[PDB]
């Protein structure tokens, strides 16, 4: 179910909890402070970015996958609702709020 | 003539040029306000990190 991206990300932007972007993801992985990693599977061909795929096998990070760039850019960050299209490709969530329905679905996804 | 303005220069996807794939491709900046991912640019007779404005050699 997709409330593992609806109930954590929209409640996570309000708390200085997003590290959105790609080089900031590399500096956040070297901080050892990645707790939640939303990848991309949308690319020109996906073999061009292998750094966030391999630095978690050095750094023991949880990974949750998605297949989309534009619905990723509609999950997190800003947009007009002639429309301001930006697209996000990798998300490090650094911090959270206090949640009682959605701690587990980001927590227990270790398969 | 005229004095030109400065445009932000565009290197294209240098985000993998901070690493070499495990093994980084440039050297680290020692700092307390920086660190945990902050490297120094290795020029031909000098080595440069932005925030501390540090030159090496
Ligand atoms: Zn420095």
């Amino acid at each position: 179910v997709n409330t593992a991206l609806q109930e954590v990300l929209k409640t996570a932007l309000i708390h200085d909890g997003l590290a959105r972007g790609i080089r900031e993801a590399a500096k956040a992985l070297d901080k050892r402070q990645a707790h939640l990693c939303v990848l991309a599977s949308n690319c020109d061909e996906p073999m061009y970015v292998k750094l966030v795929e391999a630095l978690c096998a050095e750094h023991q990070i949880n990974l949750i996958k998605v297949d989309d760039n534009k619905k990723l850019g509609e999950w997190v960050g800003l947009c007009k609702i002639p429309r301001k299209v930006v697209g996000c490709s990798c998300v490090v969530v650094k911090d959270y709020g206090k949640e009682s329905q959605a701690k587990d679905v980001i927590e227990e996804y270790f398969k | 003539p005229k004095k030109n303005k400065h445009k932000r220069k565009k290197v294209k996807l240098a985000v993998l040029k901070y690493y070499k794939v495990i093994s980084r491709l440039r050297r680290e900046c020692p700092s307390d306000e920086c660190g945990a991912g902050v490297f120094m640019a290795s020029h031909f007779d000098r080595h440069y990190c932005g925030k501390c404005c540090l030159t090496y050699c």
Side-chain angles (χ1 to χ4, degrees), chain A residues 89-109:
Chain A
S89 298
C90 276
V91 164
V92 175
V93 165
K94 176 171 71 133
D95 288 308
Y96 299 122
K98 177 70 177 173
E99 294 97 8
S100 314
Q101 194 269 350
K103 179 261 200 164
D104 48 353
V105 208
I106 53 180
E107 179 75 29
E108 261 65 30
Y109 197 80

Side-chain angles (χ1 to χ4, degrees), chain B residues 29-31 33-34 38-40 48-54:
Chain B
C29 164
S31 160
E33 59 96 20
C34 285
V38 190
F39 318 119
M40 321 190 54
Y48 172 64
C49 172
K51 210 73 173 280
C52 307
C53 278
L54 184 57

Side-chain angles (χ1 to χ4, degrees), chain A:
Chain A
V1 72
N2 49 359
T3 57
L5 282 83
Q6 268 170 38
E7 218 169 306
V8 301
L9 298 165
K10 282 196 205 318
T11 58
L13 192 40
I14 63 187
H15 300 307
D16 199 358
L18 300 204
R20 313 151 302 187
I22 191 64
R23 191 260 177 275
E24 189 183 29
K27 202 196 60 180
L29 282 174
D30 273 5
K31 277 177 186 296
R32 302 200 160 107
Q33 208 54 250
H35 298 247
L36 203 57
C37 184
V38 184
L39 303 175
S41 313
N42 212 1
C43 292
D44 53 351
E45 207 61 270
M47 210 48 253
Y48 268 37
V49 182
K50 33 192 194 157
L51 262 54
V52 71
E53 319 310 319
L55 264 289
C56 313
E58 312 173 43
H59 281 290
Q60 286 82 22
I61 310 288
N62 173 38
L63 282 85
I64 312 176
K65 278 77 177 173
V66 75
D67 300 334
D68 47 57
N69 214 324
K70 171 60 174 167
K71 206 157 60 67
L72 208 165
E74 271 204 67
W75 291 136
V76 283
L78 294 170
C79 206
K80 197 206 185 185
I81 291 95
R83 190 179 176 182
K84 185 169 193 178
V85 45
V86 68
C88 329
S89 298
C90 276
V91 164
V92 175
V93 165
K94 176 171 71 133
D95 288 308
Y96 299 122
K98 177 70 177 173
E99 294 97 8
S100 314
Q101 194 269 350
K103 179 261 200 164
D104 48 353
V105 208
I106 53 180
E107 179 75 29
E108 261 65 30
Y109 197 80
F110 288 157
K111 298 300 165 297

